Amino acid sequence: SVVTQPPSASGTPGQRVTISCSGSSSDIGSNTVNWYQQLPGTAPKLLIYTNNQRPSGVPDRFSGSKSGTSASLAITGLQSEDEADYFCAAWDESLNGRVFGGGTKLTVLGQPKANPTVTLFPPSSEELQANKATLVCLISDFYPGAVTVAWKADSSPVKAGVETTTPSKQSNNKYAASSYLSLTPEQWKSHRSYSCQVTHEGSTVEKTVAPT
Amino acid sequence: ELTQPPSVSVAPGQTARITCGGNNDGAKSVHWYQQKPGQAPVLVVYDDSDRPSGIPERFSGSNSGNTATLTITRIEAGDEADYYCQVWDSSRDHVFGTGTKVTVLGQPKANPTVTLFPPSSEELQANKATLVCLISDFYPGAVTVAWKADSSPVKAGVETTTPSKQSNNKYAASSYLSLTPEQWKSHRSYSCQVTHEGSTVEKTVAPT
Amino acid sequence: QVQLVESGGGLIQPGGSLRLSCAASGITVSSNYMTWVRQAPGKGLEWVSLLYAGGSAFYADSVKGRFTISRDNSKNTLYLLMNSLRVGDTAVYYCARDLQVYGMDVWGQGTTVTVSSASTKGPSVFPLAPSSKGTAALGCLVKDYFPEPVTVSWNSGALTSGVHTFPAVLQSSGLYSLSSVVTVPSSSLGTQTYICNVNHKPSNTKVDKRVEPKS
Amino acid sequence: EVQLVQSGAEVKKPGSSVKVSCKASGGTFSSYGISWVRQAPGLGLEWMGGVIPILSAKHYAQRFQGRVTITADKSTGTAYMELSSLRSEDTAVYYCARDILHHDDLWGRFYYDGMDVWGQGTTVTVSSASTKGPSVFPLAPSSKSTSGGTAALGCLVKDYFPEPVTVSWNSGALTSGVHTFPAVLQSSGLYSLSSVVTVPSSSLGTQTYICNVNHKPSNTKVDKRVEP
Amino acid sequence: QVQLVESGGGLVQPGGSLRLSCAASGFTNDFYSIAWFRQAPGKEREGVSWLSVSDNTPTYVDSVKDRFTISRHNANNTVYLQMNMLKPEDTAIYYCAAGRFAGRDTWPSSYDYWGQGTQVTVS
Amino acid sequence: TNLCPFDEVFNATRFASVYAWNRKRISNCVADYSVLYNLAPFFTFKCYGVSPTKLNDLCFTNVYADSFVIRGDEVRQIAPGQTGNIADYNYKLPDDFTGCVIAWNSNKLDSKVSGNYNYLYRLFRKSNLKPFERDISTEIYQAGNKPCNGVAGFNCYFPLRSYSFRPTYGVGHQPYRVVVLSFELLHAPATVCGK
Ligand SMILES: *[C@@H]1O[C@H](CO)[C@@H](O)[C@H](O)[C@H]1NC(C)=O
Predict the structure, then answer these.
(1) In what residue span(s) does the BetaCoV S1-CTD domain sit (chain F)?
(2) C-alpha F11 – ligand 1 centre gap (Å)
């Protein structure tokens, strides 16, 4: 693909930001470029359409521009609701179709450091009676939505049987994630304890469970 | 040069399919028209698959390759008409198909009664010759007539009526072949071949 | 509303001239693809001529040089001038608005044009003898008459059941021809006499013809 | 003002085909094109193809060229998008939006210039595995899930296919403190989720807690009592 | 007024020769061009050779390049197509066509004047 | 010794649609002839009012290079004194046209398996086009009595349509790239010579 956007972008609240969009002759060479804003979980909405035209409902804080094979979107007076994904797109003709950019995630600095709440459940006796074992580690109330999960058997790490979800925005605008560790009823009883390590912003919180 | 079948026969409530054939049927669009008896045509399908406003959803079109298709679902007696296809392609002229009659079956199938007469001895003396082929008691009202000299096809001098509803709701038709007395006496026999939905009835007369 | 009212039809001698009209309502002729389409009695549809919104005209091969399409913007009416007519041109003529891609949506009611000879001529009646090969069919050939209709009875109306008088053809010569047959039992062909009574009121033709088996 | 409602979510087996509808309120086609854009989970947007009804025209994106069909029935006023020979990578949310058209008169072209009104999207999942009801297990509370006099108890909804599964507690009578987590897609192709609720530890001996798991694809309802 | 008179066809063996002739009548001046179209069984009319008269410039499709020769004789206003090393592929009804231009076209509808075809059979 | 930029017109990667035909004004340059007719059996080549072999011996004031794309059945309309949807509503040549017309089958370039609907043409126009007139108007064509007001509805249709160039179509429907060269000679200093 031809269109390129920076992956991430940061901006102090109330100030100005510039998101760049790089193209070729086959897209911006002879065709207009537009911009779309997508909040996580929702559907994209139109922001700019003819290089720098604004639809009804988009404030003048957003301004587009197009110069040659490159485009740019400017956001003045950053607000909290502007934290989202931003895509540029132009009607490339070589492929006969619209092409979307890779996207640019925007982060507004003003948020704090919500630590994740971790609860670890051992395998229920009912599941063990079915000759199965699953450790459930639930992670909630963490912002920003980015965590890494690690499991430990007794005093040693383990990666076999691990399934972890991507973070998802909750109702309170914080994020949630869940991780599962599948074991045999013998691996569960054999070890002394199992631990779920959740690392968020350099700091780690560990919960530990043991057989009955 | 659009080719349409002479007629289709569908039980009430079932679905009809009418074919419209030609060469290089890809790019050009197809239009369909309904002509009830004594009426002007009414555009039923345009640009292959579009239904204009106010026309039932039972009708529908499709087109690809060398065949377009008009589909009539849940047929009623109100659909008894003739349907023509027309190509859009040429910007200076338009051509139509040969038409297709969709008889909604109001009674069981009836094979035709064919009667063929040689030219009368009184007509031959007036230096004329007319073979009279009469077709009656067939349903649905759709027949095609082919004439034969000995066993060779004859096309010139043929005058054929259109099927007309007779008393018992069946149909009747007549076909005439105008000949010269020399042409009638040269060959050994002439034949009238009437086809009615796959079945074929043929009668033959000889100069004696 | 939307209306395409036609006028100008009737009978006209061969080689003559006749001009057809197509009054428009709601649709402006001068800004539309307007066409004329004729339908021979009992045949398919044949496109004849068209007129572009820009004034370009195009005709079919069967009417080229003989037909002429025109219009009048003040009267909002389409015209079709017809010169040097023949019986092949006898048809019901329709006018319609072409949308090209969207087809011909609005059609006129259609006017009828009849071209042939004229007169009030009498038919020639020929017997259709019963074949020598349990029932037999014999009849009468009522050939070349104009105009319609003729009445055919058998044995001065004494024979009715079994009689089937078929609808007449319109030959390319403009003259009509029909046949009336009666299907009788084979055993009575030698003892009974059969005579059809053909009457043509316009020419006051009254023909009685005996139908005997072929010798 | 008009709205674009698409057909419901879809789950298909590799090799089959899916057809997503997109209702256009009234005459949306007039001077407005329609594009189909899909978005894989956690990935960017991908234009698939489009259509212009006033021009009776349509185009397709290189990637899907030869395995896609986009129709537009103007009588019903709606569009369709059918993708055949589906693969696992085709799992995405498929969107339908009206595009405002731009006129490039210099080159005599007519292409899409932004899509203002969007549909709500249609989730399409492609997985080789077939249907299966979930195995529901209780996540009992103890002294290790208790913090400050409040207890956390839940239910494990393991090994089901396909989405979705809805979970309630006490037939809907308990709503506060409930946190139903999105399901994980295991390497086996089956889904598994969890739903937990925080309650006062004092109510363990006075209130009974039952999670109501509903997996409509398998016609299975499971009511699981969770006791200490 | 303008009329094209064709001749020269016949039955020939593979490898033989044949000479087609097209006589152009009611033309005021030398500003016209001649084309030869052949209609194989079940195929459309296809150009094979062209001649712009005023320029005396010939053109031949690649499948007939070295085998066909077109030329014009001035007095009898007749264009000749000398067809050598004939192959079974060349079996077709051949037409000559004229148009009021200097050049050549692959489209038959672009020529307003046509002669009656002559049969060429190679077997 | 500037050479006339003929390569930019024939070897162009993208042609314009017929309704917005592109014209390249060529003057003050060293022309050529050989390529024109000598070339190879490529395409249609029709000259009107001038002979190709005489182009090298003539100087002209300005030479206009018109390029666009239509389907096969319409190439015959790019000629003096022609009528039709292309000739009347898109690109009209005068009756006294002095120049040549070049058109080749570009099915291998402008036709895609899913259809290349980018090439457009005008379908409705109230009157005919004058010679060398370019109408890029996209106003809703009023075919009835009621005004449209930019509303696509009954008797109010969009004046452009798409070509659908698919390689599986017949030759009369395959895309053809057209190059029209107009030779003008008026009261002016002649600069487009070819010797
Ligand atoms: C473009 O120029 C090349 C020579 O570089 C030539 O071979 C080719 O025929 C030209 N293209 C056309 C369409 O004439």
Answers:
(1) 2-194
(2) 6
Q: Which residues contact F106 (CB under 8 A, 6 or more apart)?
A: F15, F69, F174, F175, F176, F177
With b meaning 16 or more CB within 10 Å and e meaning fewer, what string describes E12-48?
Answer: beeeeebebbbbbeebeeebbbbbbbbeeeeeebebb
Q: How many residues does chain A have?
A: 212
The total of other beta-carbon atoms located within 10 Å of residue A11's CB is 19
Total domain count for chain E? 1
Please state, as a whole number, how many other Cβ atoms lie within 10 Å of the Cβ of residue A28: 25
F126: CB partners within 8 A, 6+ apart: C31, C53, C54, F141
Separation between Cα atoms, residue D145 and residue D157, nearest integer Å: 19
Q: Based on the domain organization, do F145 and F58 belong to the same domain?
A: no
Q: How far is residue A99's CA from residue A120's CA, in Å, rounded to a whole number? A: 44
Of C63, C85, C115, which residue constitutes the final position of a domain?
C115
CATH match of A10-108 with 2.60.40.10 = yes
Best mutation target, C52, C73, C102, to test chain F (most F CBs within 10 A): C52
Question: What resolution does the deposited structure have, in angstroms?
Answer: 3.1
Q: Please judge whether D110 and F160 are an interchain contact, meaning their C-beta atoms are less than 8 angstroms apart.
A: yes
Domain positions in chain A are 10-108, 117-209
Is the shortest distance between the CB of F13 and ligand 1 below 6 Å? no
CA of F109 relative to ligand 1 center, distance in Å: 14
Which two structure tokens, joined as six digits, stand for F98? Answer: 């002095």
Q: Cα Rg for chain E, rounded, in angstroms?
A: 13
CATH hierarchy code of domain B7-104 = 2.60.40.10
Q: How many helices (H) and strands (E) would you count in chain F?
A: 4, 11
- Report the CATH number at residue C110: 2.60.40.10
CA dist E81 and E17 (Å) reads 11
3-state secondary structure chain B: CCECCCEEEECCCCCEEEEEECCCCCCCCEEEEEECCCCCCEEEEECCCECCCCCCCCEEEEEECCEEEEEECCCCHHHCCEEEEEECCCCCCCCECCCEEEEECCCCCECCEEEEECCCHHHHHCCCEEEEEEEEEEECCCCEEEEEECCEEECCCEEECCCEECCCCCEEEEEEEEECHHHHHHCCCEEEEEEECCEEEEEEECCC
CATH of B113-205, one of 2.40.50.100, 3.30.70.420, 3.50.50.60, 2.60.40.10: 2.60.40.10
Across the interface, which of C31, C32, C100 has its CB nearest the CB of F123? Answer: C100
Chain A CB contacts of F112 under 8 Å are 96
Strand partners, C140: C127, C180
How much of chain F is helix, strand and coil, in % rounded to 5? 20, 30, 50
Contact E118, E4 (CB under 8 A): no
- C-alpha torsion B106→B110→B115→B116, nearest 10: 90
Do A138 and D181 meet the contact criterion of CB atoms below 8 Å apart?
yes
- Cα separation, A67 vs B69, in Å, equals 51
E54: phi > 0 → left, psi -120 to 50 → alpha, else beta; which? alpha
Would you call C137 helix, strand, or coil by DSSP? strand
Q: How far apart are CA D178 and CA D194, in angstroms?
A: 11
Please state, in angstroms and rounded to a whole number, the distance separating the CA atoms of residues F77 and C123: 55
* Method by which the model was determined: X-ray
Can you tell me the distance from the alpha carbon of B194 to that of A54, in angstroms, rounded to the nearest whole number? 73
Tell me which residue of B85, B103, B102 sits closest to B94, measured CA to CA. B85
d(CA D137, CA A164): 19
Residues D110 and D154 in one domain: no
**What CATH number is attached to the domain comprising E67?**
2.60.40.10
CA of E104 to the centre of ligand 1 (A): 19
In this structure, are F17 and F108 located in the same domain? yes
Range of the domain at D118: 4-126
